[PDB]
């Protein structure tokens, strides 16, 4: 069994989906990268570690690139004009049962569901109002 | 119009849903709290700010409590045995158009979709393997 | 194939079986945990390393907990009264054929079969005599 | 009881079984050895001591000869190339009742049951994957 | 994908082929091994890491047993006299697209194609002349 | 005979084949280059040396360029945007028979055959998983 597999990061219908695939798992940091030029690739990393005697802590990171071509002196390269960086830390006490964790996951999914405040603000270059 | 409204944080079917409602918007920090004892309430906060000349940065935070009763000297109070803390920062360059942002949101939703690596690990008190 | 699978650690004959499942592979240490909070879980880990120029060494560990509900600060926490620890190190020369290795497995199985000296002593809080 | 008796270490189904028998009890350390030269014998030793104020520790050791291409009764100067060494240390808290200890034994039996991850890895000269 | 599968390392035309199979994935380093003692096995390992700000590096290693006069399952203390070691490091700039990488693979295939200089030299215990 | 011959490094099926030819043997390093300016050429080198008293070591290197036309100082120069580098070191004991060496060649060919794990990963900007 393995959960270190490829998955769909961006569900753009069924065509133009960004799939991210495993690439390296060094030093306890799982890393996934989308295909093609590493320079324009999406990146996701995840690591879990015991932060204190009572808590475990997950550190997830995602990079969404803005695909572009750079032309310097007539030489064109595939690059990322810029990147957005998502950095999240999740602390969970060791007393949390599997049920408790499922709830935590649902809270995260709910937080970002379409239509809700946070995702609507982000999607529209806006804050709360 | 307002996006500073109540929303469903945990979609537990249609019964036992955790709804979170606005409570305070001081100093540019929007805050939502679930009903009943503040001590056992779920909490979500969000603020956006220009981090540099080129980037805007969102800071979202969620607290999932473990509901419990504390009995000290015969006096019982509603408290949270412990809390899980989600802390996420999202940096987005000012060149990002609305389309670019929608993609960013989809990446976040994809990252946490049921079945995918990260949420499956968290839900099962596990790391990547 | 993939030998990283779930298995039943304690066979109580279908009813109340302690089954353990893959939970982490960070740093080259395969880990399996029972379906409990991290504070009350059975835990098994295994790792292999080339200890010398001519040996390989498997380090296997198991934690059998005694679950309890402790009242800390007036709050009830799911905890472990104590844990029993098994620690085994197996050193196998590189010249060992697959059939040579099956011999080791059979020897370990025979060592612990019901009725044999060692498991009888352990199960009776007794020594060998 | 009087559990210090001969037993079948390797069960090859009646024909070609390896039986190991009492051979030493110096210092309360029970030793069992197969019927071979000491450089080619199967050896098992066991002893218990209270390791600390709250724990008892069983130290079990097993030595298994490399059989492929073995020359029975021959002299092989590099003995380490022809033997595998198993070292088991079982720590059991003094509160453990007999039932608790039976469960611990079952856990050990489950860990090594045929078909499960650990023994399959060992038998195939492999790690976990 | 899920390219971590068994494959034919040495193709002797169906009869007497050497198949190598997954045997370890510790630290994201994939390992494949043939069905032999570790002193006589064919071994292949592979891993990728971003070696610098602008490059990614694939490190591939292959070990091949000396077969002439080999004593199957035997103990040979000077292991180095019985194995050949191949070390490949492939550095690919992050700008390389999938097509660029296909070409790189073709170059490697061409380099080693039967009848070409390099492989003929190796196969004849020779240098270039 | 003379194994220092031209060969096709990249077989694009007759049309657009990258053929490489002998270009230097100074200092005991056999070199082959494609028919291009030294700034845009594919390059292959090989050398053999008795690395130790009992080993021989082949050092083979390949450079796959990405050709481009850069405008420097208003003038257009035929140049290389980047280069991919392959570096392989093969250590073969002196006891290796010719048939033993053919085994190594076949193993290297099998390693890179179309469809097998390693070349699939490389060609997809992916790791093994």
XYZ file of C-alpha atoms in Angstrom:
774
model
C 0.000 0.000 0.000
C 1.068 3.616 -0.518
C -0.459 7.039 -0.358
C 2.704 8.410 -1.930
C 1.147 8.328 -5.403
C 0.130 10.724 -8.137
C -3.094 12.624 -7.794
C -5.048 15.398 -9.403
C -4.146 18.763 -7.894
C -6.331 20.920 -10.145
C -9.599 19.409 -11.375
C -10.104 21.528 -14.497
C -13.024 19.515 -15.790
C -11.467 16.372 -17.261
C -9.112 18.077 -19.700
C -6.227 20.242 -18.561
C -6.112 18.682 -15.111
C -2.879 19.298 -13.285
C -1.654 15.964 -12.054
C 1.178 15.931 -9.600
C 3.466 12.873 -9.248
C 5.944 11.679 -6.584
C 9.516 12.733 -7.165
C 11.485 12.510 -3.975
C 10.993 11.490 -0.339
C 14.271 12.572 1.228
C 14.573 13.469 4.905
C 10.946 12.735 5.710
C 9.663 15.291 3.199
C 7.351 13.821 0.570
C 7.455 15.811 -2.654
C 5.226 15.739 -5.751
C 5.935 17.636 -9.014
C 3.813 18.005 -12.154
C 5.242 16.894 -15.503
C 7.250 18.805 -18.121
C 9.800 21.512 -17.369
C 10.632 21.505 -13.683
C 10.766 25.295 -14.074
C 7.023 25.488 -14.774
C 5.963 22.640 -12.503
C 3.450 22.705 -9.687
C 4.949 21.453 -6.464
C 3.494 19.948 -3.299
C 5.415 18.753 -0.254
C 4.327 17.223 3.041
C 6.015 16.128 6.212
C 4.789 15.117 9.629
C 6.790 15.315 12.778
C 6.301 15.152 16.546
C 6.483 18.844 17.502
C 6.146 18.300 21.245
C 5.337 15.473 23.624
C 1.628 15.998 22.980
C 1.432 17.214 19.402
C 2.182 15.983 15.940
C 2.530 18.658 13.274
C 1.954 18.483 9.520
C 3.665 20.969 7.210
C 2.090 21.061 3.735
C 3.272 23.348 0.926
C 1.958 24.037 -2.543
C 3.361 26.173 -5.365
C 1.159 27.315 -8.228
C 3.181 28.753 -11.095
C 2.200 31.257 -13.717
C 3.425 29.610 -16.916
C 5.340 31.897 -19.289
C 8.156 32.014 -21.825
C 11.288 34.057 -21.224
C 13.147 35.458 -24.198
C 16.620 36.737 -23.442
C 18.858 37.578 -26.373
C 16.699 35.544 -28.732
C 16.981 32.441 -26.554
C 13.618 31.368 -25.197
C 13.153 29.231 -22.107
C 10.120 27.871 -20.320
C 9.905 29.592 -16.965
C 7.358 30.677 -14.390
C 6.625 34.414 -14.509
C 5.912 34.121 -10.785
C 4.516 31.668 -8.213
C 1.867 31.712 -5.478
C 2.888 29.998 -2.288
C 0.578 28.145 0.042
C 2.166 27.206 3.336
C 0.104 25.437 5.985
C 0.843 23.936 9.377
C -1.571 21.631 11.164
C -1.032 20.692 14.819
C -2.925 17.695 16.186
C -2.653 16.397 19.798
C -1.815 12.710 20.185
C -5.162 12.164 21.904
C -6.998 12.730 18.634
C -8.643 9.544 17.498
C -9.279 8.724 13.847
C -12.780 10.208 14.173
C -11.374 13.438 15.573
C -9.009 13.646 12.603
C -11.797 13.059 10.056
C -13.575 16.032 11.588
C -10.426 18.133 11.221
C -10.260 17.220 7.553
C -13.902 18.113 7.052
C -13.289 21.489 8.684
C -10.529 22.126 6.161
C -12.692 21.021 3.233
C -15.550 23.146 4.498
C -13.310 26.161 4.911
C -12.450 26.003 1.197
C -15.722 24.801 -0.329
C -16.974 26.842 -3.297
C -19.199 29.703 -2.210
C -17.864 30.061 1.318
C -16.221 33.344 2.434
C -12.507 32.508 2.304
C -12.387 30.882 -1.129
C -14.664 33.539 -2.599
C -12.390 36.313 -1.368
C -9.195 34.676 -2.695
C -10.777 33.878 -6.051
C -11.731 37.507 -6.503
C -8.519 39.208 -5.381
C -10.395 40.364 -2.296
C -10.427 40.405 1.467
C -13.401 40.167 3.809
C -16.101 42.813 3.594
C -23.059 42.735 -0.304
C -20.876 40.888 2.208
C -18.832 37.746 2.366
C -18.473 38.291 6.098
C -21.379 35.945 6.833
C -22.025 32.644 8.546
C -21.168 29.456 6.750
C -20.927 25.751 7.309
C -17.453 24.767 8.484
C -18.130 21.053 8.980
C -20.655 19.411 6.656
C -21.666 16.469 8.847
C -24.496 15.353 6.612
C -27.315 17.809 7.310
C -27.534 17.266 11.059
C -24.724 18.199 13.414
C -23.186 20.659 10.978
C -20.813 23.093 12.592
C -21.839 26.535 11.483
C -19.505 29.379 12.198
C -20.788 32.983 12.463
C -19.126 36.430 12.340
C -18.166 37.842 15.701
C -15.585 40.539 15.302
C -13.678 42.330 12.534
C -11.183 44.389 14.510
C -7.842 45.474 13.068
C -8.439 43.910 9.670
C -8.869 40.420 11.130
C -12.208 38.817 10.292
C -13.258 36.313 12.936
C -16.013 33.672 12.975
C -17.034 31.606 16.047
C -19.513 28.733 16.364
C -22.414 29.045 18.811
C -22.697 28.071 22.486
C -19.885 28.282 25.024
C -17.022 30.299 23.605
C -14.816 27.782 25.431
C -15.938 24.942 23.146
C -16.332 26.999 19.984
C -14.716 26.446 16.617
C -12.873 29.516 15.444
C -11.815 30.805 12.036
C -9.982 34.043 11.294
C -8.773 35.638 8.073
C -6.829 38.709 7.131
C -5.221 39.929 3.949
C -2.389 42.360 3.764
C 0.173 43.651 1.268
C 3.313 41.766 2.349
C 5.639 43.392 -0.173
C 5.386 45.642 -3.203
C 4.529 42.632 -5.361
C 2.657 40.291 -3.053
C -0.538 40.192 -1.089
C -0.684 37.627 1.699
C -3.665 35.867 3.272
C -3.407 34.452 6.789
C -6.205 31.980 7.582
C -6.546 30.151 10.907
C -8.901 27.467 12.125
C -9.306 25.873 15.559
C -11.095 22.560 15.973
C -11.867 21.802 19.607
C -12.353 18.500 21.329
C -15.531 19.084 23.330
C -15.409 17.905 26.952
C -16.643 18.650 30.460
C -14.259 19.607 33.243
C -15.165 18.725 36.801
C -13.098 20.459 39.444
C -14.262 20.203 43.034
C -17.739 19.170 41.935
C -18.105 22.228 39.706
C -18.467 21.275 36.064
C -17.681 23.586 33.171
C -17.849 23.204 29.420
C -14.310 23.292 28.104
C -12.214 21.962 25.252
C -10.013 19.024 26.271
C -7.611 20.236 23.583
C -7.594 21.938 20.166
C -6.077 21.278 16.736
C -4.652 24.323 15.046
C -4.601 24.946 11.330
C -2.484 27.902 10.309
C -2.096 28.760 6.634
C -0.439 31.564 4.711
C -1.101 32.195 1.038
C 1.075 34.612 -0.951
C -0.244 35.862 -4.289
C 1.616 38.319 -6.593
C -0.336 41.400 -7.663
C -0.085 40.262 -11.282
C -2.475 37.397 -10.605
C -5.703 37.931 -12.459
C -9.041 36.590 -11.245
C -8.522 33.483 -13.401
C -5.117 32.870 -11.850
C -6.698 33.090 -8.398
C -9.494 30.638 -9.278
C -6.784 28.172 -10.238
C -5.070 28.717 -6.887
C -8.322 27.951 -5.112
C -8.822 24.805 -7.153
C -5.308 23.674 -6.253
C -6.203 24.051 -2.586
C -9.495 22.189 -3.005
C -7.744 19.462 -4.948
C -5.040 19.136 -2.329
C -7.700 18.315 0.281
C -10.242 16.354 -1.759
C -11.337 13.036 -0.233
C -9.113 10.174 -1.320
C -6.030 12.219 -2.138
C -2.754 11.614 -0.236
C -2.665 14.518 2.227
C -6.218 14.276 3.554
C -6.014 10.492 3.753
C -2.860 10.671 5.851
C -4.273 13.277 8.272
C -7.564 11.423 8.637
C -5.722 8.278 9.635
C -3.163 9.717 12.053
C -0.515 8.981 9.442
C 2.266 10.436 7.366
C 3.247 9.589 3.801
C 4.282 6.038 2.994
C 3.552 -6.601 -5.050
C 4.433 -4.201 -2.238
C 4.971 -5.845 1.047
C 3.939 -2.665 2.919
C 0.485 -3.982 3.840
C -1.866 -4.116 6.772
C -1.860 -7.263 8.891
C -3.348 -8.581 12.084
C -0.894 -8.203 14.921
C -3.040 -9.940 17.518
C -5.328 -12.729 16.388
C -8.172 -12.986 18.886
C -10.046 -15.149 16.396
C -12.053 -12.660 14.331
C -13.601 -10.865 17.331
C -11.424 -8.067 18.714
C -8.480 -8.629 16.408
C -5.792 -5.987 16.633
C -5.039 -5.162 13.044
C -2.196 -2.791 12.281
C -1.869 -0.626 9.135
C 0.850 1.277 7.222
C 1.196 4.760 8.642
C 4.584 6.228 7.708
C 7.784 5.591 5.798
C 9.589 8.808 6.606
C 13.356 8.382 6.947
C 13.304 4.804 5.730
C 11.508 3.465 8.801
C 8.382 1.550 7.868
C 5.663 2.133 10.447
C 2.303 0.540 11.122
C -0.180 1.649 13.781
C -3.478 0.308 15.070
C -6.631 2.285 14.436
C -6.460 4.366 17.642
C -5.329 7.763 18.816
C -1.581 8.106 18.631
C -1.633 7.947 22.446
C -3.247 4.506 22.621
C -1.967 2.813 19.476
C -0.122 -0.432 18.962
C 2.937 0.386 16.909
C 5.270 -1.656 14.739
C 8.329 -0.321 12.923
C 11.007 -2.014 10.751
C 14.114 -0.850 9.034
C 16.992 -2.482 7.195
C 20.514 -1.136 6.808
C 23.829 -2.554 5.619
C 25.462 -2.574 9.066
C 28.902 -3.701 7.915
C 30.537 -4.533 4.615
C 29.144 -8.078 4.864
C 26.022 -7.937 7.065
C 22.522 -6.507 6.822
C 20.550 -5.721 9.923
C 16.815 -5.576 10.441
C 15.635 -3.537 13.405
C 12.057 -4.367 14.324
C 10.098 -2.843 17.210
C 6.609 -3.406 18.609
C 4.717 -1.468 21.307
C 1.803 -3.144 23.060
C -0.162 -0.583 25.092
C -2.485 -1.002 28.041
C -5.289 1.477 27.348
C -6.851 3.549 30.102
C -8.871 6.711 30.682
C -6.993 9.114 32.923
C -8.601 12.175 34.475
C -6.153 15.057 34.103
C -7.176 18.485 35.352
C -10.779 17.344 35.662
C -10.859 16.264 32.019
C -10.859 12.645 30.834
C -8.111 11.805 28.347
C -7.762 8.602 26.333
C -4.333 7.408 27.379
C -2.013 4.420 27.993
C -1.398 3.140 31.534
C 1.823 1.521 30.318
C 3.472 0.005 27.271
C 5.367 -3.198 26.755
C 8.309 -2.938 24.332
C 9.715 -5.589 22.010
C 13.041 -4.864 20.394
C 14.628 -7.175 17.890
C 17.753 -6.876 15.811
C 18.441 -9.486 13.177
C 21.855 -9.606 11.505
C 22.044 -11.647 8.303
C 25.239 -12.096 6.262
C 25.075 -11.049 2.598
C 25.975 -14.611 1.626
C 22.608 -15.780 2.908
C 20.524 -17.228 0.139
C 16.732 -16.823 0.036
C 16.373 -20.380 1.308
C 18.855 -19.533 4.066
C 16.638 -16.605 5.037
C 13.424 -18.749 5.059
C 15.219 -20.863 7.630
C 15.580 -17.837 9.885
C 11.892 -17.027 9.588
C 10.904 -20.576 10.419
C 13.236 -20.570 13.416
C 11.656 -17.409 14.750
C 8.185 -18.848 14.220
C 9.139 -22.069 15.958
C 10.679 -20.130 18.830
C 7.310 -18.551 19.620
C 4.849 -21.345 18.806
C 2.218 -22.051 21.489
C 3.413 -24.653 23.964
C 7.123 -24.137 23.430
C 9.332 -23.075 26.385
C 9.848 -19.361 25.763
C 6.265 -18.266 25.109
C 5.106 -20.401 28.046
C 7.466 -18.651 30.437
C 6.566 -15.162 29.226
C 2.865 -15.927 29.437
C 3.273 -17.101 33.011
C 5.469 -14.321 34.444
C 8.051 -17.025 34.864
C 11.623 -17.748 33.903
C 12.911 -20.943 32.304
C 13.623 -23.826 34.677
C 5.988 -26.378 34.991
C 9.646 -27.167 34.126
C 9.606 -25.599 30.750
C 13.306 -26.283 30.153
C 12.706 -28.995 27.572
C 13.604 -29.941 24.034
C 11.482 -28.382 21.258
C 11.174 -28.094 17.486
C 12.868 -24.889 16.357
C 12.379 -25.324 12.612
C 9.263 -27.201 11.556
C 9.818 -28.664 8.094
C 6.807 -30.953 8.429
C 8.177 -33.965 10.311
C 10.898 -34.774 7.798
C 14.050 -32.720 8.334
C 12.908 -30.842 11.431
C 15.474 -29.044 13.549
C 15.078 -29.929 17.175
C 16.985 -27.923 19.723
C 17.758 -29.348 23.208
C 18.880 -28.106 26.665
C 22.638 -27.738 26.798
C 23.510 -25.302 29.557
C 21.937 -23.580 32.545
C 24.927 -21.695 33.901
C 23.815 -18.520 35.688
C 20.129 -19.193 35.196
C 20.584 -18.531 31.462
C 18.862 -21.396 29.665
C 20.585 -22.592 26.513
C 19.324 -24.938 23.811
C 21.489 -26.183 20.979
C 20.986 -28.394 17.944
C 23.049 -31.505 17.358
C 26.016 -29.979 15.483
C 29.479 -28.557 16.010
C 29.173 -25.262 17.789
C 30.180 -23.422 14.649
C 27.201 -24.914 12.822
C 24.562 -25.286 15.520
C 21.189 -23.607 15.947
C 21.325 -21.949 19.340
C 18.708 -20.369 21.571
C 19.237 -18.679 24.942
C 16.804 -17.045 27.304
C 16.914 -15.193 30.672
C 14.772 -12.746 32.663
C 15.810 -10.054 35.110
C 14.088 -7.052 36.625
C 15.671 -4.335 34.477
C 14.408 -1.428 36.571
C 12.093 -0.584 39.432
C 9.097 -0.929 37.134
C 10.065 -3.356 34.368
C 11.157 -6.938 33.789
C 13.172 -7.756 30.663
C 13.388 -11.047 28.768
C 16.543 -11.325 26.682
C 16.225 -13.971 23.987
C 18.922 -14.776 21.465
C 18.861 -17.130 18.504
C 21.725 -18.082 16.161
C 20.932 -19.706 12.790
C 23.576 -21.359 10.549
C 23.871 -20.515 6.863
C 23.048 -23.840 5.243
C 23.485 -23.297 1.489
C 26.826 -24.833 0.421
C 27.606 -25.711 4.026
C 30.211 -28.421 4.531
C 28.954 -30.412 7.498
C 31.550 -30.655 10.230
C 33.953 -28.552 8.236
C 36.139 -25.746 9.490
C 35.191 -22.266 8.254
C 37.351 -19.578 9.804
C 35.060 -16.648 9.072
C 32.201 -17.833 11.257
C 30.292 -14.576 10.974
C 29.781 -15.183 7.271
C 27.982 -18.401 8.125
C 25.571 -17.329 10.891
C 22.658 -14.997 11.419
C 22.107 -13.459 14.850
C 18.722 -12.614 16.365
C 18.547 -10.478 19.460
C 15.231 -9.940 21.197
C 14.642 -7.817 24.266
C 11.120 -7.835 25.661
C 10.330 -5.252 28.320
C 7.211 -5.885 30.371
C 5.975 -3.524 33.144
C 5.581 -5.195 36.522
C 1.856 -4.435 36.429
C 1.276 -6.787 33.526
C -0.901 -9.693 34.556
C -0.669 -13.137 32.973
C -3.424 -12.162 30.534
C -1.523 -9.056 29.542
C 1.500 -11.264 28.885
C -0.555 -13.719 26.764
C -1.557 -10.812 24.568
C 2.075 -9.732 24.238
C 2.938 -13.241 23.106
C 0.124 -13.146 20.552
C 1.441 -9.846 19.236
C 4.846 -11.456 18.716
C 3.247 -14.430 17.005
C 1.225 -12.146 14.774
C 4.258 -10.084 13.854
C 5.977 -13.189 12.471
C 3.050 -15.110 11.032
C 3.625 -16.470 7.536
C 2.519 -14.085 4.804
C 2.768 -10.933 6.912
C 5.075 -8.043 5.887
C 8.112 -8.478 8.180
C 8.711 -12.202 7.630
C 8.096 -11.872 3.885
C 10.655 -9.104 3.655
C 13.252 -11.131 5.552
C 12.600 -14.275 3.531
C 13.095 -12.414 0.265
C 16.321 -10.632 1.209
C 14.292 -7.418 1.039
C 13.272 -4.294 2.864
C 9.802 -2.741 2.904
C 8.466 -1.254 -0.332
C 2.046 5.698 -13.745
C 3.537 3.613 -10.884
C 6.679 2.694 -12.655
C 8.089 0.842 -9.638
C 7.651 -2.604 -11.159
C 9.595 -5.731 -11.971
C 11.515 -5.737 -15.280
C 13.943 -7.778 -17.364
C 17.472 -6.553 -16.688
C 19.327 -9.065 -18.858
C 17.476 -10.285 -21.929
C 18.888 -13.658 -22.962
C 15.936 -14.349 -25.246
C 13.300 -15.773 -22.897
C 15.431 -18.645 -21.638
C 17.739 -17.626 -18.795
C 16.594 -14.018 -18.486
C 17.506 -12.053 -15.385
C 14.488 -10.358 -13.936
C 15.003 -7.800 -11.226
C 12.184 -6.900 -8.774
C 11.304 -4.136 -6.255
C 12.984 -4.774 -2.931
C 13.236 -1.494 -1.064
C 11.882 2.045 -1.171
C 13.499 3.490 1.933
C 14.053 7.238 1.537
C 12.424 7.408 -1.868
C 15.384 5.465 -3.299
C 13.900 2.688 -5.417
C 15.769 -0.602 -5.302
C 15.384 -3.678 -7.490
C 17.198 -6.923 -6.832
C 17.417 -10.306 -8.526
C 16.538 -13.514 -6.732
C 19.928 -14.328 -5.152
C 21.946 -13.865 -1.989
C 22.910 -10.244 -1.692
C 26.509 -11.094 -2.457
C 25.453 -12.543 -5.807
C 22.451 -10.451 -6.807
C 21.943 -8.055 -9.702
C 20.984 -4.764 -8.113
C 19.586 -1.524 -9.481
C 18.820 1.674 -7.561
C 17.451 4.987 -8.710
C 16.626 8.413 -7.173
C 16.150 12.022 -8.312
C 16.835 15.254 -6.470
C 17.197 18.867 -7.514
C 20.993 19.129 -7.377
C 21.114 22.909 -7.737
C 18.955 25.915 -8.479
C 18.951 25.028 -12.165
C 19.452 21.264 -12.424
C 17.863 17.968 -11.438
C 20.086 14.896 -11.087
C 19.161 11.232 -11.517
C 21.554 8.902 -9.720
C 21.344 5.360 -11.053
C 23.473 2.492 -9.819
C 23.729 -1.067 -11.078
C 25.715 -3.978 -9.600
C 26.419 -7.057 -11.756
C 27.785 -10.364 -10.364
C 30.773 -12.100 -11.926
C 29.233 -15.345 -13.134
C 32.120 -17.384 -14.580
C 33.112 -20.062 -12.029
C 30.586 -18.686 -9.559
C 29.512 -21.064 -6.808
C 25.820 -20.368 -6.331
C 24.996 -19.541 -2.740
C 28.617 -19.854 -1.759
C 30.589 -17.579 0.512
C 33.303 -15.521 -1.200
C 35.000 -13.143 1.200
C 36.489 -10.824 -1.403
C 33.177 -9.593 -2.771
C 34.758 -6.856 -4.854
C 36.463 -9.462 -7.008
C 33.054 -10.840 -7.906
C 31.066 -7.698 -8.796
C 31.117 -4.878 -11.296
C 29.776 -1.470 -10.281
C 28.025 0.986 -12.598
C 27.445 4.528 -11.464
C 25.379 6.877 -13.591
C 24.640 10.502 -12.830
C 22.333 12.283 -15.252
C 22.076 16.048 -14.901
C 19.111 17.672 -16.607
C 18.454 21.461 -16.573
C 15.066 22.421 -15.174
C 14.128 23.908 -18.546
C 14.140 20.524 -20.232
C 10.677 19.587 -21.403
C 9.461 15.998 -21.659
C 10.526 15.936 -25.314
C 13.987 17.117 -24.383
C 14.144 14.280 -21.859
C 13.002 11.693 -24.457
C 15.912 12.747 -26.624
C 18.305 12.385 -23.691
C 17.019 8.860 -23.174
C 17.544 8.092 -26.860
C 21.102 9.370 -26.611
C 21.727 6.959 -23.737
C 20.166 4.122 -25.698
C 22.269 4.963 -28.722
C 25.447 5.118 -26.677
C 24.932 1.512 -25.563
C 23.368 -0.028 -28.648
C 24.879 -3.350 -29.688
C 27.733 -2.986 -32.156
C 28.620 0.585 -31.205
C 32.121 1.479 -29.916
C 31.623 1.777 -26.130
C 29.723 -1.477 -25.550
C 32.037 -3.390 -27.894
C 35.062 -2.159 -25.997
C 33.571 -3.170 -22.649
C 32.473 -6.574 -23.912
C 35.958 -7.351 -25.187
C 37.859 -6.299 -22.063
C 39.292 -3.492 -24.196
C 39.825 0.217 -24.488
C 39.436 2.307 -27.641
C 41.913 1.755 -30.473
C 39.320 -3.826 -36.557
C 39.517 -0.542 -34.655
C 36.583 0.134 -32.485
C 37.118 3.918 -32.770
C 34.268 4.425 -35.247
C 31.395 6.761 -35.903
C 27.971 5.744 -34.625
C 24.493 7.138 -34.301
C 23.961 8.527 -30.837
C 20.311 9.416 -31.337
C 18.232 7.257 -33.640
C 15.349 9.363 -34.925
C 14.707 6.716 -37.565
C 16.850 7.809 -40.514
C 15.547 11.402 -40.598
C 17.428 13.753 -38.273
C 19.684 11.133 -36.740
C 22.392 12.517 -34.503
C 25.492 10.707 -35.617
C 28.700 11.239 -33.690
C 32.246 10.807 -35.080
C 35.811 10.313 -33.768
C 37.387 13.677 -33.087
C 40.319 13.290 -30.688
C 42.381 10.792 -28.737
C 44.752 13.196 -27.045
C 45.775 12.099 -23.547
C 44.126 8.712 -23.867
C 40.587 10.097 -23.868
C 38.629 8.927 -26.887
C 36.307 11.672 -28.095
C 33.465 11.798 -30.582
C 31.540 14.920 -31.590
C 28.506 15.596 -33.752
C 28.951 17.498 -36.983
C 28.403 20.976 -35.489
C 30.393 23.918 -34.229
C 32.251 23.068 -31.062
C 29.737 25.326 -29.284
C 26.679 23.315 -30.322
C 28.033 19.778 -30.550
C 26.933 16.573 -28.903
C 29.999 15.100 -27.267
C 30.935 11.630 -26.079
C 34.197 10.687 -24.375
C 35.507 7.384 -22.916
C 38.612 6.361 -21.109
C 39.835 3.256 -19.322
C 42.398 3.084 -16.535
C 43.533 0.424 -14.074
C 42.023 2.112 -11.006
C 43.380 -0.341 -8.443
C 45.549 -3.431 -8.507
C 42.464 -5.532 -9.308
C 39.921 -3.241 -11.010
C 39.614 -1.410 -14.313
C 37.403 1.611 -14.634
C 35.668 3.024 -17.674
C 34.698 6.680 -17.473
C 32.125 7.578 -20.101
C 30.545 11.009 -20.577
C 27.886 12.379 -22.921
C 26.728 15.982 -23.462
C 23.336 16.596 -25.040
C 22.981 20.267 -26.015
C 19.919 22.396 -26.614
C 20.875 24.540 -29.611
C 19.905 28.190 -29.847
C 20.837 31.420 -31.610
C 21.798 34.090 -29.105
C 22.222 37.740 -30.037
C 25.366 38.995 -28.314
C 26.460 42.574 -28.909
C 24.050 42.872 -31.821
C 25.576 39.840 -33.529
C 23.901 36.429 -33.784
C 26.005 33.543 -32.485
C 25.268 29.835 -32.863
C 25.201 28.694 -29.262
C 23.759 26.252 -26.684
C 20.938 27.335 -24.357
C 21.918 24.535 -21.974
C 23.478 21.092 -21.847
C 22.428 17.903 -20.160
C 25.305 15.820 -18.755
C 25.555 12.051 -18.400
C 28.392 10.709 -16.316
C 29.057 7.031 -15.918
C 31.819 5.140 -14.192
C 32.002 1.397 -14.619
C 34.347 -0.627 -12.411
C 35.063 -4.169 -13.592
C 37.330 -6.607 -11.723
C 40.255 -8.058 -13.695
C 38.849 -11.533 -13.066
C 35.907 -10.715 -15.307
C 35.830 -12.951 -18.325
C 34.635 -11.715 -21.730
C 31.320 -13.464 -21.138
C 31.162 -11.785 -17.727
C 31.614 -8.432 -19.457
C 28.871 -9.157 -22.080
C 26.577 -9.602 -19.107
C 27.332 -6.063 -17.978
C 26.569 -4.675 -21.418
C 23.281 -6.525 -21.588
C 22.352 -5.280 -18.123
C 22.989 -1.699 -19.142
C 20.959 -2.176 -22.313
C 18.107 -3.735 -20.378
C 18.227 -0.928 -17.831
C 17.426 1.618 -20.542
C 15.077 -0.304 -22.846
C 11.864 1.530 -23.817
C 9.062 0.821 -21.375
C 11.237 -0.106 -18.423
C 10.990 1.926 -15.175
C 14.067 4.153 -15.333
C 13.760 5.503 -18.875
C 10.030 6.047 -18.316
C 10.655 8.199 -15.261
C 13.378 10.268 -16.921
C 11.242 10.809 -19.998
C 8.387 12.046 -17.844
C 10.233 14.410 -15.477
C 9.208 11.989 -12.786
C 10.768 9.917 -10.051
C 10.156 6.224 -9.411
C 7.034 5.373 -7.417
